[PDB]
Design a protein around this ligand. Structure first.
Ligand SMILES: O[C@@H]1[C@@H](O)[C@H](O[C@@H]2CO[C@@H](O[C@@H]3CO[C@@H](O)[C@H](O)[C@H]3O)[C@H](O)[C@H]2O)OC[C@H]1O
Length: 302
């Protein structure tokens, strides 16, 4: 645990949180990891336990052991929770992707959303209802949901989420929304504008922000461009930067800090060894679970 909590300093600027991720393994693999989460971060996103493959492995048969643990740990330690993720083409069981009947897929989609959200009703700050539904050019990704149901799946997912838990902020999450003018950014903005005008309950846009070295400075503009979609809020949901330079990290923190709609930042992991991009040392804590330079840089910028 770093003596200075970046979550605390971020919150002092009016932001809701500066969080990270977790699940049973990383929360128990050693003493430093859970200790860092409790001391320096104010929000948690389950790294894998709430995804479709881990929650409904067989049609109508749910497995909530992992998700229960993450939710319980967060709730037991005053950490906000971002549910992740309800509808996604990746980490999706074969039984779902093989469905070809529209009404059958809609029923399945609604039952999944309903069961997962009802189990944690009122405990979730934000749900990534839809994840990565756009192609790089801004068009809609041809996942089984898009192919079988069509564009109406967007409305169905959000409306169902809204009715099941009206207390949760409903998000559409995606990666590569990292610089203004990028095709995917333009596609995210125009579609959301349309969906909001049609009455679809989309509360926020989540920008994963998985960056390469030097890409930090373009994030501010990307967030400004996303703010034009018209959602109530936006958030950096899965931050990690190859090389973890202070310049990059401070640039990203300031990007959110200086944009009114940005409610928080979630770093995709605590320490480098546990990163899904470990070879690039993209996180705030090192192999010894000690604060890296970027962590201190972030603290001193706040
Ligand atoms: O068997 C499981 C592994 O296959 C799985 O690997 C994870 C893959 O997802 C990563 O989280 C995503 C990163 O990219 C984004 O676009 C998604 O929205 C995130 O959810 C995660 O970090 C990897 O660990 O997880 C481990 C096993 O459960």
């Amino acid at each position: 645990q770093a003596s200075v909590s970046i979550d605390a300093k971020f919150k002092a600027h009016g932001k809701k949180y500066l969080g990270t991720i977790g699940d049973q393994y990383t929360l128990t693999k050693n003493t430093k990891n859970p200790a860092i989460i409790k001391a320096d971060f104010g929000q948690l996103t389950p790294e894998n336990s709430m995804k479709w493959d881990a929650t409904e492995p067989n049609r109508g048969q749910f497995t909530f052991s992992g998700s229960d643990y993450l939710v319980n740990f967060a709730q037991s330690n005053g950490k906000l929770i971002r549910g992740h993720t309800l509808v996604w083409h990746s980490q999706l069981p074969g039984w779902v992707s093989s469905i070809t009947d529209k009404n059958t897929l809609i029923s399945v989609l609604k039952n999944h959303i309903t069961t997962v959200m009802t189990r944690y009703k009122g405990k979730i700050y934000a749900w990534d209802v839809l994840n990565e539904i756009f192609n790089e050019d801004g068009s809609l990704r041809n996942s089984v949901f898009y192919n079988v149901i069509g564009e109406d799946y967007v409305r169905i997912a959000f409306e169902t989420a809204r009715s099941v838990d009206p207390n949760a902020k409903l998000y559409i999450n995606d990666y590569n929304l990292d610089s203004a003018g990028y095709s995917k950014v333009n596609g995210m903005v125009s579609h959301v504008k349309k969906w909001l005008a049609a009455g679809i309950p989309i509360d926020g846009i989540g920008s994963q922000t998985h960056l390469g070295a030097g890409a930090g400075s373009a994030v501010a503009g990307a967030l400004n461009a996303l703010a034009s979609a018209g959602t109530k809020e936006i958030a950096i949901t899965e931050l990690d930067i190859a090389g973890a330079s202070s310049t990059d990290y401070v640039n990203v923190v300031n990007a959110c800090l200086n944009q009114a709609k940005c409610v928080g930042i979630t770093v995709w992991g605590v320490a480098d060894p546990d990163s899904w991009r470990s070879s690039s040392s993209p996180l705030l804590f090192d192999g010894n679970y000690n604060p890296k330079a970027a962590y201190n840089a972030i603290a001193n910028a706040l």
